[PDB]
Design a protein around this ligand. Sequence first.
Ligand SMILES: O=C([O-])C(=O)/C=C/CC(=O)c1ccccc1
Length: 283
Amino acid sequence: LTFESTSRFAEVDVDGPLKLHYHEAGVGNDQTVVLLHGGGPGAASWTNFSRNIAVLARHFHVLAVDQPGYGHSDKRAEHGQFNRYAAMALKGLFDQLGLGRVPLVGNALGGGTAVRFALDYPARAGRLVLMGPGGLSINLFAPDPTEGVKRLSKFSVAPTRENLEAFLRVMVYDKNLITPELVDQRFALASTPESLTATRAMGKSFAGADFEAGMMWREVYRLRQPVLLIWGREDRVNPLDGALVALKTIPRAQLHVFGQCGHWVQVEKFDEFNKLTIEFLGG
Ligand SMILES: O=C([O-])C(=O)/C=C/CC(=O)c1ccccc1
């Protein structure tokens, strides 16, 4: 599987044409699963999941979607609360692709979008796997904005290589993962005009008139499906205390925490994460 072989585009309607880029794999597998990546600078489906995608595609029909504002999806300068906006785009994609009820795997901002989708279009979301998710998290102990969120904001204001590297270093427990090559690669993607534009629009959308749509910890008691929360013990973006309200109030919740793991569980605990996900989604 390559970036190019799996690449797909769809045009959906969200207050007008919206181009969504995604990656498709495991065609011919019975159960479809949608992956939604995080909202870091230069983040996209392939960057976030390329290696997980190969493994999951052995078991599932994988659709890894670049959320609007990211990757090769449209990067509008304006939109409503981000997760509701992205969930509307996803609903458009489901309808176009003829998807019924499908499980979703989402990390961070993508976890928030998965949850917003499951709440807004309840018939359409199956089991959820959420890694250090935004939206349904509320940091009962950590002062907000957290270290991770601050570093993202600082880059968005001052898009320097140094600031990007600073952000990446708080995504992981093992900082040796933040190589010069990774930094250089992510910076090239994160510092384009369209990307900076998008990032800004995203952060600010959480404080718009529909900000309550982002406060999903107030609503997830309504979720009827099993939900597997997965957290790195050392997550410095959406820290572990953020898991508690969701764990308490989602009737069929489970939580798995990995020690010696940061925000990027799908990278730092690759094997364990893939196995949990495969088992939970029933493969
Ligand atoms: O994509 C990555 O590099 C990553 O997982 C970063 C996630 C941060 C994120 O989703 C976020 C978005 C908005 C506000 C705070 C946090």
